[PDB]
Coordinates of C-alpha atoms and ligand atoms in Angstrom, one line a residue:
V1 CA 6.1 -4.1 -12.1
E2 CA 2.5 -3.1 -12.3
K3 CA 1.1 -3.1 -8.9
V4 CA -1.8 -0.7 -6.8
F5 CA -0.7 2.4 -6.4
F6 CA -1.7 2.3 -2.8
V7 CA -1.5 6.1 -1.5
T8 CA -2.1 6.4 1.9
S9 CA -3.0 9.3 4.6
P10 CA -1.9 9.2 8.7
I11 CA -5.1 7.4 10.6
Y12 CA -6.7 10.2 13.1
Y13 CA -6.4 9.9 16.6
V14 CA -10.2 10.6 17.5
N15 CA -9.6 12.4 21.0
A16 CA -11.7 15.6 19.2
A17 CA -13.1 16.6 16.1
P18 CA -11.9 16.6 12.7
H19 CA -10.2 19.6 12.0
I20 CA -8.2 21.4 9.0
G21 CA -4.5 19.3 9.4
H22 CA -6.3 16.3 9.2
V23 CA -8.5 17.1 6.3
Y24 CA -4.9 18.6 4.7
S25 CA -3.3 15.5 5.1
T26 CA -6.8 13.2 3.6
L27 CA -6.5 16.5 0.7
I28 CA -2.7 15.3 -0.2
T29 CA -3.3 11.7 -0.6
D30 CA -6.8 12.8 -1.8
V31 CA -4.7 14.5 -5.3
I32 CA -1.8 12.0 -5.8
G33 CA -4.9 9.3 -5.6
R34 CA -6.9 11.0 -8.3
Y35 CA -3.6 11.8 -10.6
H36 CA -2.4 8.1 -10.6
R37 CA -6.5 7.0 -11.4
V38 CA -5.7 10.2 -14.2
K39 CA -3.2 8.5 -15.7
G40 CA -5.1 5.9 -15.8
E41 CA -3.7 3.2 -13.2
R42 CA -4.8 1.1 -10.4
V43 CA -5.8 3.5 -7.6
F44 CA -6.6 2.8 -4.0
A45 CA -6.5 5.6 -1.7
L46 CA -6.7 5.1 2.2
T47 CA -7.4 6.7 5.9
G48 CA -9.3 6.3 8.6
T49 CA -8.8 6.7 13.0
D50 CA -6.9 5.5 15.6
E51 CA -8.6 5.0 18.1
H52 CA -7.1 2.9 21.0
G53 CA -5.0 4.0 23.6
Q54 CA -5.0 6.4 26.8
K55 CA -4.6 9.4 24.5
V56 CA -8.3 8.9 23.7
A57 CA -9.6 6.6 26.5
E58 CA -9.0 9.6 28.0
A59 CA -10.7 12.1 26.2
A60 CA -14.2 9.3 26.2
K61 CA -13.7 9.6 30.3
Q62 CA -13.5 13.8 30.0
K63 CA -16.5 13.9 28.1
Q64 CA -18.4 10.6 30.7
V65 CA -18.8 8.8 27.5
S66 CA -18.2 4.6 27.2
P67 CA -14.7 4.6 24.7
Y68 CA -16.7 2.5 22.4
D69 CA -19.8 5.5 22.4
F70 CA -16.5 7.8 21.8
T71 CA -14.9 6.2 19.5
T72 CA -17.8 5.6 17.6
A73 CA -19.6 9.1 16.9
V74 CA -15.9 10.7 16.3
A75 CA -14.9 7.9 13.9
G76 CA -18.7 9.2 12.5
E77 CA -17.3 13.0 12.5
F78 CA -14.7 11.9 11.0
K79 CA -16.4 10.4 8.0
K80 CA -18.8 12.8 7.8
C81 CA -16.8 15.7 7.3
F82 CA -15.1 13.6 4.6
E83 CA -17.1 12.8 3.0
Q84 CA -18.1 16.8 2.7
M85 CA -15.1 17.6 1.6
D86 CA -15.6 15.0 -1.4
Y87 CA -12.7 13.3 -1.8
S88 CA -12.5 9.8 -4.2
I89 CA -11.2 7.6 -1.3
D90 CA -11.5 4.0 -1.8
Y91 CA -12.0 3.0 2.1
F92 CA -12.1 4.5 5.5
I93 CA -9.9 2.1 8.2
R94 CA -11.2 2.0 11.7
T95 CA -8.3 -0.1 14.2
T96 CA -10.7 -1.4 16.2
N97 CA -11.7 -2.8 13.4
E98 CA -11.6 -7.0 14.4
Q99 CA -9.8 -8.1 10.9
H100 CA -6.9 -4.8 11.5
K101 CA -6.7 -6.7 15.5
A102 CA -6.1 -9.8 13.7
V103 CA -3.1 -8.1 11.3
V104 CA -1.3 -6.7 14.5
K105 CA -1.7 -9.8 16.3
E106 CA 0.2 -11.7 13.5
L107 CA 2.6 -8.9 12.9
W108 CA 3.7 -8.5 17.2
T109 CA 3.5 -12.7 16.7
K110 CA 6.2 -12.0 13.7
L111 CA 8.8 -9.7 15.1
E112 CA 8.3 -12.2 18.5
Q113 CA 9.6 -15.3 16.8
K114 CA 11.9 -13.0 14.7
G115 CA 13.6 -12.2 17.7
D116 CA 13.4 -8.8 18.3
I117 CA 10.7 -9.0 21.0
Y118 CA 11.9 -9.1 25.1
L119 CA 10.5 -7.9 28.5
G120 CA 12.7 -5.5 30.1
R121 CA 11.3 -2.1 30.9
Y122 CA 10.9 2.1 29.8
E123 CA 11.3 4.6 32.4
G124 CA 11.4 7.5 31.0
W125 CA 9.3 10.0 29.7
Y126 CA 6.3 10.3 27.5
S127 CA 4.1 12.4 26.0
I128 CA 0.3 11.7 26.2
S129 CA -1.1 14.1 23.8
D130 CA 1.9 12.7 21.2
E131 CA 2.0 8.8 22.7
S132 CA 5.4 9.0 22.5
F133 CA 8.4 8.7 24.1
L134 CA 10.6 11.4 25.0
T135 CA 14.5 11.8 26.5
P136 CA 15.1 14.3 28.8
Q137 CA 16.7 16.3 26.2
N138 CA 13.4 16.4 24.3
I139 CA 11.5 17.9 27.3
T140 CA 11.8 21.4 28.9
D141 CA 9.6 23.3 31.8
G142 CA 6.0 24.1 31.9
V143 CA 2.9 24.7 32.6
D144 CA 0.1 22.4 33.4
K145 CA -3.8 23.1 32.8
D146 CA -3.8 24.4 37.1
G147 CA -1.7 27.0 36.5
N148 CA 1.3 24.5 38.1
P149 CA 5.0 24.1 37.1
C150 CA 5.6 20.5 35.2
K151 CA 7.5 18.8 32.0
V152 CA 6.8 19.9 28.3
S153 CA 7.7 18.4 24.8
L154 CA 9.9 20.5 23.6
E155 CA 8.4 19.0 20.3
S156 CA 4.2 19.6 20.9
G157 CA 4.7 21.3 24.1
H158 CA 1.7 18.8 25.8
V159 CA 2.1 18.2 29.4
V160 CA 4.9 15.2 29.7
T161 CA 4.9 12.6 32.8
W162 CA 7.5 9.8 34.3
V163 CA 7.1 6.1 33.2
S164 CA 8.3 3.9 34.8
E165 CA 7.3 -0.3 33.7
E166 CA 8.0 -3.4 32.2
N167 CA 7.0 -3.7 29.0
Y168 CA 7.5 -6.0 26.0
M169 CA 10.4 -4.2 24.0
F170 CA 11.2 -3.9 20.1
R171 CA 15.3 -4.6 19.5
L172 CA 15.5 -1.1 17.5
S173 CA 18.7 -0.3 18.4
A174 CA 19.4 -3.3 16.0
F175 CA 18.3 -1.9 12.5
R176 CA 20.4 1.5 12.7
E177 CA 22.9 0.0 9.8
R178 CA 20.0 -1.4 8.2
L179 CA 17.7 1.5 8.2
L180 CA 21.3 3.5 7.1
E181 CA 21.7 1.6 4.7
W182 CA 17.5 2.0 3.7
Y183 CA 17.6 5.7 3.0
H184 CA 21.2 6.1 0.9
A185 CA 19.8 3.4 -1.2
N186 CA 16.6 5.6 -1.3
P187 CA 17.9 9.1 -1.4
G188 CA 14.4 9.9 -2.8
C189 CA 12.3 8.0 -0.1
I190 CA 12.0 11.7 2.3
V191 CA 10.6 14.2 0.8
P192 CA 11.0 16.8 1.4
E193 CA 15.3 16.4 1.5
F194 CA 15.5 18.5 4.7
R195 CA 13.7 16.1 6.7
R196 CA 15.4 13.4 5.3
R197 CA 18.4 14.5 6.2
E198 CA 17.3 15.3 9.9
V199 CA 16.6 11.9 10.1
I200 CA 19.3 10.7 8.5
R201 CA 21.4 12.8 11.1
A202 CA 18.4 11.2 14.1
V203 CA 19.4 7.4 13.7
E204 CA 23.3 8.4 13.0
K205 CA 23.2 9.1 16.7
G206 CA 22.1 5.8 17.7
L207 CA 18.6 4.3 18.7
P208 CA 17.5 3.1 21.9
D209 CA 15.2 -0.4 22.1
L210 CA 11.2 1.0 21.9
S211 CA 9.0 -0.2 24.0
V212 CA 6.0 -2.0 23.2
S213 CA 3.5 -2.6 25.3
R214 CA 2.6 -0.7 28.3
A215 CA 0.8 -2.3 31.6
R216 CA -2.7 -2.2 31.1
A217 CA -4.6 -0.8 34.0
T218 CA -2.8 2.8 32.3
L219 CA -4.2 2.3 28.9
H220 CA -7.4 1.5 30.8
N221 CA -7.8 -1.4 28.8
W222 CA -8.4 0.1 25.5
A223 CA -6.2 -1.8 23.4
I224 CA -4.7 -4.9 21.8
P225 CA -4.5 -7.5 24.1
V226 CA -0.4 -8.6 23.8
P227 CA -0.8 -12.3 22.0
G228 CA 0.0 -14.9 24.9
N229 CA 0.7 -12.3 27.7
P230 CA -3.4 -10.9 29.1
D231 CA -1.2 -8.2 31.7
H232 CA -0.4 -6.0 28.5
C233 CA -1.4 -4.1 25.8
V234 CA 0.4 -3.2 22.1
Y235 CA 2.0 0.0 21.8
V236 CA -1.2 2.3 20.5
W237 CA 1.6 3.0 17.0
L238 CA 2.7 -0.1 16.7
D239 CA -1.5 -0.7 16.5
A240 CA -1.9 2.0 14.4
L241 CA 1.1 2.1 11.7
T242 CA -0.2 -1.7 11.3
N243 CA -3.4 0.0 9.6
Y244 CA -0.8 0.2 6.6
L245 CA -0.7 -3.0 5.9
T246 CA -4.6 -4.4 7.2
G247 CA -6.0 -1.8 4.9
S248 CA -4.1 -3.6 1.9
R249 CA -5.2 -6.7 2.9
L250 CA -9.0 -5.5 3.0
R251 CA -11.0 -6.4 -0.1
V252 CA -13.7 -3.6 0.4
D253 CA -17.1 -4.0 -1.6
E254 CA -19.4 -1.4 -3.4
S255 CA -20.9 0.9 -0.4
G256 CA -16.7 1.2 1.0
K257 CA -17.4 -1.8 3.6
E258 CA -15.1 -4.4 4.4
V259 CA -16.0 -7.7 3.2
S260 CA -12.7 -9.9 3.6
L261 CA -9.2 -10.4 4.8
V262 CA -7.1 -11.4 2.3
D263 CA -4.1 -13.9 3.8
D264 CA -1.3 -12.2 1.8
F265 CA -0.7 -8.6 0.8
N266 CA 0.1 -10.4 -2.7
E267 CA -2.9 -11.2 -3.2
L268 CA -4.4 -7.5 -3.7
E269 CA -0.8 -5.7 -4.8
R270 CA -1.1 -2.6 -2.6
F271 CA 1.3 -3.2 -0.3
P272 CA 3.8 -1.2 0.4
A273 CA 2.6 2.4 0.1
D274 CA 3.6 4.0 -2.6
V275 CA 3.2 7.4 -1.4
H276 CA 2.9 7.5 2.7
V277 CA 1.3 11.2 3.6
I278 CA 2.0 12.3 7.0
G279 CA 2.6 15.3 9.5
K280 CA 6.1 16.9 10.3
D281 CA 4.7 16.1 13.9
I282 CA 4.9 12.0 12.8
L283 CA 8.1 11.4 10.9
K284 CA 10.2 9.7 13.5
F285 CA 7.2 6.6 13.5
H286 CA 7.2 6.3 10.2
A287 CA 10.7 6.7 8.7
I288 CA 12.7 4.9 11.5
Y289 CA 9.8 2.6 13.8
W290 CA 7.7 1.6 10.8
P291 CA 10.8 0.6 8.4
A292 CA 12.3 -1.0 11.4
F293 CA 9.2 -3.0 11.9
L294 CA 8.7 -4.3 8.6
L295 CA 12.6 -5.5 8.1
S296 CA 12.1 -7.5 10.8
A297 CA 9.4 -8.8 10.1
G298 CA 10.3 -9.6 6.6
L299 CA 7.7 -7.6 5.1
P300 CA 8.4 -5.3 2.1
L301 CA 9.6 -1.3 2.7
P302 CA 7.8 2.1 1.6
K303 CA 9.0 4.3 -1.9
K304 CA 8.5 7.3 -0.5
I305 CA 7.3 9.4 2.9
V306 CA 5.9 12.9 2.2
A307 CA 5.9 14.9 5.3
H308 CA 4.2 18.3 5.1
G309 CA 4.4 21.3 8.0
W310 CA 1.7 22.6 10.1
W311 CA -1.4 25.2 9.6
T312 CA -1.5 29.1 11.2
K313 CA -4.9 31.4 10.6
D314 CA -3.7 35.0 9.9
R315 CA -0.3 34.3 11.4
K316 CA -1.4 32.9 14.5
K317 CA -2.3 28.9 16.4
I318 CA -4.8 28.1 15.0
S319 CA -7.5 27.5 18.2
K320 CA -10.9 27.2 19.5
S321 CA -9.7 27.7 22.6
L322 CA -8.2 31.0 21.4
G323 CA -9.2 33.0 19.3
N324 CA -8.9 31.8 16.1
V325 CA -11.0 29.2 14.3
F326 CA -10.3 27.5 11.1
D327 CA -13.0 25.5 9.4
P328 CA -12.7 24.2 6.1
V329 CA -16.1 22.9 5.2
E330 CA -17.1 26.7 6.6
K331 CA -14.3 28.2 4.5
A332 CA -15.2 25.7 1.3
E333 CA -19.4 26.3 1.6
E334 CA -17.9 30.3 2.0
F335 CA -15.2 30.6 -1.1
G336 CA -15.8 27.3 -2.7
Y337 CA -14.6 23.2 -2.9
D338 CA -12.0 23.3 -5.9
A339 CA -10.9 26.6 -5.0
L340 CA -9.9 26.2 -1.2
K341 CA -8.2 22.7 -2.9
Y342 CA -6.7 25.1 -5.3
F343 CA -5.8 27.5 -2.4
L344 CA -4.6 25.1 0.3
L345 CA -2.0 23.5 -2.0
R346 CA -0.8 26.0 -4.1
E347 CA -0.2 28.2 -0.7
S348 CA 2.5 26.3 0.4
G349 CA 4.6 23.7 0.0
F350 CA 5.8 20.7 2.7
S351 CA 8.8 22.0 3.0
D352 CA 6.3 25.3 4.3
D353 CA 3.4 25.7 7.2
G354 CA 1.2 27.7 5.7
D355 CA -1.3 30.4 6.1
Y356 CA -4.2 30.7 5.5
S357 CA -6.1 34.3 5.4
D358 CA -9.3 35.7 3.9
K359 CA -7.6 37.8 1.7
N360 CA -4.9 36.1 0.6
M361 CA -7.7 33.6 -0.6
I362 CA -9.6 35.7 -2.2
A363 CA -6.4 37.0 -3.5
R364 CA -5.7 33.7 -5.3
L365 CA -8.8 33.1 -6.0
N366 CA -9.5 36.4 -8.2
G367 CA -5.4 35.7 -10.0
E368 CA -5.4 32.6 -10.4
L369 CA -8.9 30.5 -10.6
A370 CA -10.7 33.6 -11.8
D371 CA -8.8 35.7 -14.2
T372 CA -6.3 33.6 -15.3
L373 CA -8.0 30.2 -15.7
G374 CA -11.5 31.8 -15.8
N375 CA -11.4 33.9 -18.2
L376 CA -9.2 31.6 -20.7
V377 CA -12.0 29.2 -20.7
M378 CA -14.8 32.6 -21.2
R379 CA -12.8 33.9 -23.7
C380 CA -12.3 30.7 -26.2
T381 CA -15.6 29.0 -25.7
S382 CA -17.9 32.8 -25.9
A383 CA -19.7 33.0 -28.9
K384 CA -18.5 36.1 -29.9
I385 CA -14.9 34.7 -30.6
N386 CA -15.8 31.2 -31.4
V387 CA -18.8 31.8 -33.9
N388 CA -19.3 27.8 -34.8
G389 CA -19.2 27.3 -31.3
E390 CA -16.7 24.1 -32.3
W391 CA -13.0 23.6 -32.4
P392 CA -11.5 24.9 -35.7
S393 CA -9.4 23.8 -38.0
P394 CA -5.8 24.8 -37.0
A395 CA -3.7 26.8 -40.2
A396 CA -0.2 27.1 -40.6
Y397 CA 1.1 28.1 -37.5
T398 CA 3.7 31.2 -37.3
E399 CA 7.2 31.1 -34.8
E400 CA 5.2 33.1 -31.8
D401 CA 2.3 29.8 -32.1
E402 CA 4.6 27.0 -32.5
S403 CA 6.5 28.4 -29.2
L404 CA 3.4 28.6 -27.0
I405 CA 2.8 25.1 -28.5
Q406 CA 6.3 23.9 -27.5
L407 CA 4.8 25.0 -23.7
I408 CA 2.3 23.0 -23.7
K409 CA 3.4 20.1 -25.4
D410 CA 6.2 20.1 -22.4
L411 CA 3.7 20.2 -19.6
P412 CA 2.5 17.5 -18.9
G413 CA 6.3 15.9 -18.6
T414 CA 7.2 19.0 -16.3
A415 CA 3.7 18.8 -14.4
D416 CA 4.1 14.2 -13.9
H417 CA 7.8 14.4 -12.3
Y418 CA 6.1 16.7 -9.9
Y419 CA 3.3 15.4 -9.4
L420 CA 5.6 12.4 -8.5
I421 CA 8.1 13.7 -5.7
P422 CA 5.6 14.1 -4.6
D423 CA 5.6 18.5 -4.8
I424 CA 1.9 19.3 -5.5
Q425 CA 2.5 23.2 -5.2
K426 CA 5.5 23.0 -8.2
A427 CA 3.0 21.1 -10.1
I428 CA 0.2 23.8 -10.3
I429 CA 2.7 26.4 -10.3
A430 CA 4.0 24.7 -13.5
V431 CA 0.5 24.6 -15.0
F432 CA -0.8 28.0 -13.7
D433 CA 3.2 29.1 -16.1
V434 CA 1.7 27.8 -18.7
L435 CA -2.0 29.5 -18.6
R436 CA -0.1 32.5 -18.2
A437 CA 1.7 31.9 -21.7
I438 CA -1.9 31.1 -23.2
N439 CA -3.3 34.1 -21.5
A440 CA -0.8 36.3 -23.1
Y441 CA -0.8 34.7 -26.3
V442 CA -4.0 35.7 -26.4
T443 CA -4.0 39.1 -25.1
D444 CA -1.4 39.3 -28.5
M445 CA -3.8 38.2 -30.7
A446 CA -6.5 39.4 -30.5
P447 CA -9.2 37.2 -31.6
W448 CA -12.2 38.7 -31.0
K449 CA -10.3 41.7 -33.7
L450 CA -9.4 38.7 -35.8
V451 CA -13.3 37.4 -36.1
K452 CA -13.4 40.1 -38.8
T453 CA -10.4 40.7 -40.3
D454 CA -8.6 37.2 -39.8
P455 CA -11.0 34.3 -39.9
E456 CA -8.1 31.7 -41.3
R457 CA -5.5 33.6 -38.6
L458 CA -8.7 33.0 -35.5
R459 CA -8.8 29.1 -36.2
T460 CA -5.5 29.0 -35.5
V461 CA -5.6 30.9 -32.8
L462 CA -8.7 29.4 -31.0
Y463 CA -7.3 25.8 -31.4
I464 CA -4.3 26.5 -29.8
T465 CA -6.5 28.0 -27.1
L466 CA -8.8 25.5 -26.1
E467 CA -5.8 23.0 -27.0
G468 CA -3.9 24.6 -24.2
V469 CA -6.9 25.4 -22.3
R470 CA -7.8 21.3 -22.7
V471 CA -3.7 20.1 -21.8
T472 CA -3.7 22.3 -18.4
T473 CA -7.2 21.8 -17.1
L474 CA -6.5 18.0 -17.4
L475 CA -3.3 18.3 -15.4
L476 CA -5.5 20.1 -12.8
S477 CA -8.4 17.9 -13.0
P478 CA -6.4 16.1 -9.3
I479 CA -6.8 19.6 -8.0
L480 CA -9.8 20.9 -9.7
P481 CA -12.5 17.8 -9.4
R482 CA -15.8 19.6 -10.1
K483 CA -14.4 22.5 -12.5
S484 CA -12.2 20.4 -14.7
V485 CA -15.8 18.8 -15.4
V486 CA -17.5 21.7 -16.4
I487 CA -15.0 22.7 -18.1
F488 CA -14.8 19.8 -20.2
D489 CA -18.1 19.7 -21.0
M490 CA -18.1 23.8 -21.8
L491 CA -15.3 22.5 -23.8
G492 CA -17.1 19.6 -25.8
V493 CA -14.2 16.8 -24.4
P494 CA -15.7 13.7 -25.3
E495 CA -15.3 11.5 -22.0
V496 CA -12.8 9.1 -23.3
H497 CA -10.6 12.0 -23.5
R498 CA -10.6 12.9 -20.0
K499 CA -8.1 10.9 -18.9
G500 CA -5.3 8.4 -19.4
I501 CA -2.0 9.1 -21.0
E502 CA -2.7 8.8 -24.2
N503 CA -5.0 12.7 -24.0
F504 CA -1.6 14.5 -22.1
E505 CA -1.0 14.6 -25.5
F506 CA -1.4 17.8 -28.1
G507 CA -4.2 17.5 -30.3
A508 CA -5.7 14.8 -28.8
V509 CA -9.5 16.3 -29.3
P510 CA -9.1 16.5 -33.4
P511 CA -10.8 19.2 -35.3
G512 CA -15.2 19.8 -35.6
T513 CA -15.2 18.5 -32.3
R514 CA -18.4 20.3 -30.5
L515 CA -18.5 23.1 -27.9
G516 CA -21.0 22.7 -24.8
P517 CA -24.2 24.4 -24.5
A518 CA -24.2 27.7 -23.0
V519 CA -26.0 28.6 -19.7
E520 CA -26.4 32.4 -19.8
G521 CA -24.4 33.9 -17.5
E522 CA -23.1 30.9 -16.1
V523 CA -19.3 31.8 -14.8
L524 CA -16.4 29.6 -13.8
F525 CA -15.1 30.8 -10.7
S526 CA -17.1 34.8 -9.4
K527 CA -14.7 37.2 -8.5
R528 CA -15.0 38.1 -4.8
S529 CA -14.9 41.1 -3.3
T530 CA -12.0 42.2 -1.2
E531 CA -13.0 42.7 2.9
Ligands
LIG601 C1 -0.5 5.4 11.4 S1 -1.1 7.2 11.4 C2 -0.9 7.8 13.4 C3 -1.5 9.2 13.5 C4 -2.0 9.9 15.2 N1 -3.2 8.9 15.4 C5 -1.9 11.0 14.8 O1 -3.2 11.2 15.0 O2 -1.0 11.7 15.0

């Protein structure tokens, strides 16, 4: 099934400025997209902002501005931040978009015509901050911002309020069996595995019907009207999840501006998502509600949902109100963009809540990027070792030579599998296991002595090293997109050989290829003092 590989991030609430969590989710989306482009596939990578709802409306009122001006301004902050982060995202969607609204109304009407929406009541707890309905088992006692006793979410700790409203209800209870059948038929469809198990357990227990509208006053009229009923607004989450469908149907011009909404998703060959990237906090929406809506509407289901953890800094919660900020742009200016991306993707897996510190950041940058990767690139390109400034023609390979070559040949298949799970941390570790092996081979062969002692042997050692650096760098190119270009330039790898599965093969760059010119004193990753 040849198709556009479709990868998404969440669309973020615009109640406040963008921060590490948004940057991280979008980074993961970006990396997955980049890897599939490197394989020569068609890719559409989507990110954006979730701009309706009571949460956003009350954030605007607290700043005392119009919701239109507020959402526009904060959406602009997200766009600027992502531009600065140097992603390769194909479209940035906003739920205030008029074509998105049309797709939401269309989907609603399909659900209704299917018989899965009825007029009922919700009486229960709601978290405005999570826009989430909660049972009494999912709240506990806590304190409000005036210090008074209130109820709070056990999941998020935000304040909950009791809602009692005549609402349109979606028959979620009727999809239990079909959802379980979907999880069991596709046991890789939620990653990591323990989060898949959580979803299955939750759905096993039973599902209540879900409120998919609210009275218009509650939302301060900042939402999409229910087709045929002006007194109701569409649940912000049904509106929000629909962004994935809208995005799959938007034709986008060179400037990244939407110019047309197509009638049917098949026309652009994107829907359904191959990967939805999300945080663990929004798993039920994506793994339970979304597939149920899609089943009701007769739409195909996503292939994989990958849910990551939440970051801390110096083992404490990241917060402006407390004394612990973590600004990605600032840290990227300090340590480098590719380096910061590397750290975020290497330091933690999707099953973990990662922790940043300047100490650990510096140790990875010095140890892995400078001492392992950078040092190797400089060694095989130096005029002192590579006297002719080119890829030599290798002579006969020893067993030691071949053992390293085997690792280099095996690497693409292994990295590929990890990128597809996806488990980016493991992909990175696999590549760096090969970089460490190449370094120990270089140390063991001492090519600097071979220049005088055995130039023929040096040709072999040097060729293996160059090719190892090239293959590893290609597989890291989604992680270090700017630095990989610098590496390929230093190596003189022609543009055509910088992507495509043909170039996963050992030996793709021929002997006699000239290295790129040298710039005096210009290192790849400069080591930084440990403060
Ligand atoms: C359809 S993904 C919506 C995610 C939600 N706006 C959030 O920031 O958590």
